[PDB]
Amino acid sequence: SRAEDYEVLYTIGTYGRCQKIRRKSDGKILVWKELDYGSMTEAEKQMLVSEVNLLRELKHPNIVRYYDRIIDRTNTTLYIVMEYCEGGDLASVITKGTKERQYLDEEFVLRVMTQLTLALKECHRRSRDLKPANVFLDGKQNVKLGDFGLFVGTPYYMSPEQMNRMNEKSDIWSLGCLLYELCALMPPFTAFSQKELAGKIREGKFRRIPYRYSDELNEIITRMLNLKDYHRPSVEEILENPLILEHHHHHH
Ligand SMILES: CCOc1cc(-c2nc(-c3cc(OC)c(OC)c(OC)c3)cnc2N)ccc1C(=O)O
Ligand SMILES: [Cl-]
Ligand SMILES: [Cl-]
Ligand SMILES: [Cl-]
Ligand SMILES: [Cl-]
Ligand SMILES: [Cl-]
Ligand SMILES: [Cl-]
């Protein structure tokens, strides 16, 4: 309700800045996203209101949880309060692995696969970017999909359908790309330009993920990267995989 209900501890990152905060009433650790709407038009503020209502709706263990919205009309600043994910985002995990030359555990990849697949299933059920920067880790081995998604960069994760026209199986391809990058510490198709990239995607060829990962894990990631959307496994078919066990799911 009010900014003064919370105390900022410090800034985590800088669409304004993201800050770790403490709710005064009970000391709960949260974060908020700080947005200056002062320069926005009425139309834009209207679709901002629409977006925020949308986030207040989705509740799921594998989706970053919204708590509150605070309007500071004096500084024309809006705060979106959400849960704190102490393990940060998946992009930093991959970069860390890349820089330090250390692959991630299969167990970790299975957790990401299982929990992101359940996030997707929920998103599809309701009607969000499937990329490492939009994936967050809490302090309990849980994985959460953030709200990014609802030019300069190469569109590494774009499916062959999207690269022409025109589909939930497209999301499966994107997940395949993300899990592939998590394993290999590089995307399955790399290139310097989008046109070069598009040429590679159309061939649909890539390296096997590293041998430290099982044939079973390689197989399902490879299936997700099938050129034909109808050969990619559905969320249901993914979760039926013998690889995926109770402990790979979320725990409170
Ligand atoms: C502008 C980003 O919006 C979101 C932020 C979070 C969110 N992020 C973190 C977080 C914590 C970190 O500390 C380790 C960290 O450094 C690696 C980090 O890097 C980006 C992020 C903690 N809690 C959070 N709730 C979640 C979702 C969003 C979003 O808008 O989807
Ligand atoms: Cl390595
Ligand atoms: Cl391993
Ligand atoms: Cl390899
Ligand atoms: Cl166990
Ligand atoms: Cl539960
Ligand atoms: Cl949870």
Structural domain count of the chain? 2
What's the gap in Å between 1 CA and the centre of ligand 7? Answer: 25
Q: Are residues 174 and 77 in the same domain?
A: no
Please tell me whether residue 185 adopts helix, strand or coil conformation.
coil
Q: Are residues 5 and 116 in the same domain?
A: no
Give CA–CA dist 75/64, Å, rounded: 27
148 lines ligand 1 (CB under 6 A): yes
For ligand 1, mutation pick of 15, 18, 22, 116 (most atoms within 8 Å of CB): 18
Domain containing 119: what range?
42-64+86-252
Whose Cα sits closest to atom 4 in ligand 1?
A: 146
Q: Which of 129, 147, 215, 229 is catalytic?
A: 129
> Is 190 within any annotated ligand binding site?
no
Whole-angstrom CA distances from 141 to 80, 114, 124, 148, 192 are 24, 12, 24, 21, 35
**What are the residues whose beta carbons fall under 8 Å from the beta carbon of 145, sequence distance 6 or more?**
62, 63, 64, 116, 119, 120, 123, 128, 130, 134, 135, 136
**185's tokens:** 């510490």
Give CA–CA dist 209/7, Å, rounded: 45
Contact 154, 197 (CB under 8 A): yes
**129's tokens:** 């970017």
Q: What is the CATH number of the domain that holds 34?
A: 3.30.200.20
The ligand 1 atom nearest the CA atom of 87: 14
Pairing relationship of beta strands 135-137 and 18-23 according to DSSP bridges: unpaired
Contact 114, 120 (CB under 8 A): no
Q: What is the maximum span of the chain, computed from C-alpha positions, in angstroms?
A: 58
229 is catalytic: no
**42's tokens:** 């009425």
> Is 33 within any annotated ligand binding site?
yes
Helix, strand counts (H, E) of the chain: 7, 8
**Method for structure elucidation:** X-ray
Q: Are residues 37 and 4 in the same domain?
A: yes
Which amino acid makes up residue 28? Answer: K
Measured in angstroms, the resolution is 2.1
**What are the residues whose beta carbons fall under 8 Å from the beta carbon of 113, sequence distance 6 or more?**
175, 179, 220, 238, 243, 244, 248
Q: Are residues 117 and 161 in the same domain?
A: yes
Match 């994910």 to its residue by tokens. Answer: 85
What's the gap in Å between 136 CA and the centre of ligand 1? Answer: 7
Report CA Rg, the chain. Answer: 19
Contact 8, 24 (CB under 8 A): no
Q: Are residues 20 and 120 in the same domain?
A: no
